[PDB]
């Protein structure tokens, strides 16, 4: 109940990764397209924690 | 009913980010579910309606 | 749920450290590159400078030509198609000549002749780099431990590609230049030689490869455990034994009965990793030249239930 | 703990106003779909 | 039996179980509650291995093999002569390992150092429990575990590896092998660097950490630092084990065909699955 | 609501704009791909059938 | 106020942001209208 | 409008670099999509039109 | 008002140049799309 | 126009290096795409024209 | 500004840079003209 | 075009010439290997068939 | 001037570089002409 | 091309000569290996066929 | 000028020797290629 900014940033990135991955796996014809787009956005989101 | 102490105990930025992502993902998944089912697949039903395929 | 010192919780960025100048020709040394915050979380953020001398140039030229020659053959195998190039990148391979040609250099350029050219570039590239490790240590006046630790790696590298093919009298025994090919070469190596697991020297190398992971997990955790006493500064602990060196000594003394020093643990470290390839080179060298089937060899030496 | 009572209360008022607007549009869309294609 | 500096650190406390009941030293070893469990499980495990050699009918240490129960017994008990001993040894081995990790925890608290070492050891145990417990339970047979023999647990590796063709194509395996090779590369470099800085050319002074960073910056243009390399050593080892545990827990549970067949998904990507030329088509 | 302006008091405008740019581009790309995925609304396929390109 | 923005600056920033939002939404409506004329989806 | 003030908030160097990468990647993505389709592959179109194959 | 340290008049001129490029870039794009539609329409 | 001011924002050293790398990789990518296709593979088609095979 | 170039330096730098750009594009146009004559792609 | 000498005010000649020397050789090798790769323009094979050097 | 070279030195440096470039191009033209005669590729 | 000698006012002779020797040796080996690759021009095999050294 | 520290006369002398070696290397190369073309022409 005392998550830091980095802890919350990672948790949202995992949620974003799963969410966006499913989004572009449906949109694209392959699951890899979701993995790439979901991974890149989550990595970009988790690498920029506001502080 | 107060519902304003939550902004005092929690970080407002965390709350807004969490709500924004969850609702957007929820709204996105529902749209994907409708496109998956043959019913309510508005793209397919409109194509049949106007004799596309 | 406390600070485990795995990642730095704060970064400080002072002026770039240009390094020592014992006998290093500063003309051959380059300038300081960028500062990486992403690298700063784990270790130092500063990149560069890097020294580039005569052996540095020879290492890069042969290293680039080795890398370039594999790439051109990778493009030719792709039909010069960028889409095909990325699709079959791991499945590309610069195969050595066919077994018929033996050790002769008469192989056609597209049938093994190109591999000899690429292999020559790698050969010069690696040996020139080994001297570079030697000379960089000599320039700063340090020990040649890296040079001889590297020579352990070269021994396995020489055996796989150069020495063992000569004894087998065929370039076909060497390693193809590819991601999946040199994996397939590895698997085909065991199957031909009868379950390379029963190679005694291959088993030893796995012992030291497992042990290197064991020792570095042990050593890395130990220093991070005693990093709260400034134990990461191992050179000062060797010079002036602080409380971190004593606790690190005592933890393993009370755990497994015996311990090491701050300087003697790194003797275990270097020999644990050196034997990985040192025993590896002998293990591969014997295969085929001395033992054509290790499981049959294992049976006659009381390692398998039969015979 | 960064915000006081008045700051948090005004923040909540803004949030609910946005929430009511979001809900109202959601109702309008749901009605339009049911008019176009009933499910219930 | 004490080092020249050991006395001042030998104080009570830090025990997890037993208090001062087992808080004593046998020679250099510290006993603790979990060391008593350690010695019992270690001694019992060793004897049953020796007794298993009697039942097997061989005394050659390399031929000694404690095979797990056959696939027909599933995940139940087995006769001691045909699998039951292996289950007892595995329970003894599991008890010995976890007691050893928890004994290290007591030594950590007594010395006031971090718990990186028992946490590092726990990774090995979960790697061990993956092979003998987690994977066989998912596959529903103790026979999928490996025998407790020097050269028969290699037969298990070879047989399990070739069940799925060339096991090299396991993607989690490729990650772990790169980590194992990288860790040994780091250890050789790290060990050699400190010795070079501590045992330099004859007559020259002992080198400083700056020479260590200067050497590797003159070599590869980047020095990770004394703190970084030990962080790197810990993470490289744990990642290698974590992916090795992962590689087996997905094999025979999620993937069942040859691992080379798995890699065709990349070749069969929609935008280049049908382009002529190259290796695949 | 006229009090929405206070959202900028707590959220850095730089961080939001970067987040908005990525989100809008991602949403726009996904919708375009969904239209392309379906045999209908794949305007490239639509024109080819219309003008008999195959 | 984490951002250190003043009340007036937030209002000015929001007014410009909404102006861009309406400009963006206006183009999207025109683009959707063109598609519906070309190919309705209802 | 007052869109000029967006440069009072964004660093021009980073935006131009991001825009430069974005436009090029978008241009590449579109050009590859055209080549992917059986139609609009102008290389294929010319070969069939002029009987190169 | 001071996130980047850029003067307000500097922002006005920087945006004026930036929009000039944006219209110039989009003008060529329109000419490019016009030629393609003439060559091969996608509607 | 006044495009010269982009050099006030962009370091000429970085841009020219980035452009030099960009132009070569673009030139290489285009040339390989043409070489990949059976048409425009000017080496292949000249051999066919003069019956080299 | 950021680069420290004077406005006269920027104009001179841009002038020669555009000279190179049109020189580069001029050869590219001739190259595309030659290829289209030899083998048109439309 | 007469002001192209201004490039040497920006680019270090030492860095450029090393970069160019590597570039030109790697380009020249790439072109030469492309010709050798093709069934035609493999001038070694061409003269071998021309002079009946196959046997 | 990032390199620190004066304009006269750059003018000299360019003059040598362009003289080298034209000589390199001149041999390349002869090389391409010789190959085109021996084996044309168009 | 008289001014060519100016190249040494910028290039360090030690660096150039080391690069020169490295380049020529690596180039010389590459050509010799390329010639030995082709069945023709393999001067260790044409003489063997000429004098019938190997059956 | 200052990148190497050499003077014009030193560079002139240094270049003169370097070209002397270069022409000797080139001349031997030309003789070598002629020997190959006489013994086995590749055109
Ligand atoms: C089906 C496959 C076979 C098998 C076939 C082989 C074969 C074949 C070989 C090994 C070898 C090894 N095997 Mg085995 N192996 C199998 C099963 C296993 C298992 C297991 C749990 O099943 C394990 C843990 C191992 C473990 C190991 C290692 C201990 C050992 C390699 C050491 C090393 O670092 O090599 C990798 C390191 C090198 C080769 C050294 C490289 C050094 C040079 C100088 C690096 C140059 C870099 C180059 C220029 C690139 C530069 C790039 C730029 C820097 C970017 N094997 C089965 C039985 N194994 C090797 C060995 O020595 O065996 C005795 C070997 O040759
Ligand atoms: C004890 C046994 C271990 C060990 C030991 C050691 N290994 C060393 C040293 C020691 C002690 C050095 O001193 C030396 C070095 O400087 O390190 C920083 C080196 C190196 N180990 C490399 C790779 C490597 N080690 C591997 C394995 C192990 N090594 C085993 C486990 C493996 C695999 C397959 O597992 C790989 C791939 C390079 C990074 C580097 C040589 C660079 C080179 O040759 O460049 C020359 C080659 C090039 C420049 C090619 C460049 C290609 C384009 C341009 C890019
Ligand atoms: C996770 C990263 C690495 C990692 C980590 C760490 N590892 C640690 C530590 C850390 C950090 C410690 O702190 C601790 C220790 O103190 O170190 C000195 C430990 C230890 N690492 C051991 C061995 C080791 N690490 C391996 C791997 C890695 N380690 C990975 C790579 C491997 C292999 C195979 O790769 C081996 C063999 C022991 C020496 C020691 C436990 C002693 C024990 O538990 O004693 C109690 C057990 C006994 C005395 C054995 C006899 C009794 C049992 C019941 C008999 C069981 C029989 C057995 C099943 C038979 C199998 C036969 C076989 C042929 C099929
Ligand atoms: C004080 O806290 C802090 C830490 O330290 C405790 C930190 O470590 C870090 C440093 C950490 C980062 C900068 C990045 C961390 C973010 C990640 C872990 C990225 C997440 C990665 C994934 C979701 C994996 C999946 C991604 C894939 C496979 C897509 C890529 C695929 C191809 C390109 C092909 C920060 C910033 C920090 O604030
Ligand atoms: C622990 C060992 C790890 C590393 C093993 C490397 C290979 C060792 C084997 C080898 O080379 O064998 C052939 C060589 C030579 O074979 P040899 O044929 O000359 O002698 C073996 C004798 N007979 C045939 C009767 C078996 O063996 C040896 O040199 C003997 C090594 C014995 C090591 C035994 C360890 C026993 C550990 C306790 C029992 C635990 C059981 C559980
Ligand atoms: C597989 C996973 C196995 C994981 C085992 C974890 C055991 C952790 C023991 C933690 C003990 C904490 C505690 O307060 O226990 C109180 C008691 C012991 O209390 P105590 O009386 O020794 O006092 C503990 C506090 N000190 C020593 C500081 C005074 O724990 C137990 O009941 C013993 C542990 C049982 C172990 C079960 C093994 C099976
Ligand atoms: C799978 O689902 C499918 C795809 C089928 C259907 C999709 C469903 C869903 C869930 C879609 C999602 C829709 C949503 C949530 C859309 C959201 C859109 C938004 C929020 C758009 C906002 C746009 C705003 C813009 C473009 C603003 C632009 C602003 C400017 C141009 C000016 C900015 C400059 C400023 C403020 C200057 C700074 C000021 C000062 C004083 C310094
Ligand atoms: C899957 O989707 C497919 C691919 C099918 C279809 C694609 C869909 C999508 C999502 C498409 C996205 C399109 C978008 C978002 C396009 C956006 C385009 C924009 C905004 C382009 C902007 C271009 C701007 C340019 C080229 C500006 C150039 C400016 C200059 C060269 C001058 C700069 C110099 C300055 C400012 C000098 C500085 C001045 C002073 C006073 C210091
Ligand atoms: C998959 O897509 C395919 C490949 C199928 C189709 C391709 C699509 C795409 C994405 C194509 C992209 C094309 C682009 C982005 C082309 C851009 C071209 C540009 C902008 C080229 C610029 C060339 C400029 C040159 C060559 C400038 C040369 C200048 C000089 C030689 C002089 C330099 C000297 C200076 C500036 C001296 C400095 C002055 C002082 C006073 C210090
Ligand atoms: C895949 O694509 C394929 C390979 C199929 C087709 C290829 C496509 C591509 C991408 C081709 C690219 C071609 C390019 C970019 C060619 C560029 C060539 C250039 C720029 C060549 C320049 C040559 C210059 C030379 C040889 C200059 C030599 C100069 C000297 C030897 C003298 C140096 C000494 C100096 C300057 C003294 C300095 C003086 C003072 C006073 C300091
Ligand atoms: C894949 O492509 C294949 C392999 C098929 C075909 C290959 C194609 C290619 C890319 C070929 C490339 C050829 C090139 C670039 C060849 C270049 C040759 C050169 C430039 C050779 C130069 C040699 C120079 C020599 C040997 C000069 C030696 C000089 C000396 C020994 C004397 C030096 C002494 C001095 C300066 C005295 C010091 C002076 C003072 C005042 C102290
Ligand atoms: C677009 O990409 C470009 C073209 C720009 C560049 C890309 C290049 C690429 C994609 C490069 C890829 C390289 C790869 C995949 C390399 C993989 C290497 C691996 C996995 C190697 C593994 C084992 C190799 C060994 C053990 C090699 C040993 C070699 C030696 C010991 C040298 C032997 C020496 C010999 C045969 C000398 C023979 C010659 C004479 C004259 C006696
Ligand atoms: Fe250490």
UniProtKB/TrEMBL annotation, chain A:
Keyword entries, A-Z: Membrane, Transmembrane, Transmembrane helix
Regions crossing the membrane: 6-25, 31-48
Superkingdom: Bacteria
Protein name in UniProt: Uncharacterized protein
Organism (species): Cereibacter sphaeroides (strain ATCC 17023 / DSM 158 / JCM 6121 / CCUG 31486 / LMG 2827 / NBRC 12203 / NCIMB 8253 / ATH 2.4.1.) (Rhodobacter sphaeroides)
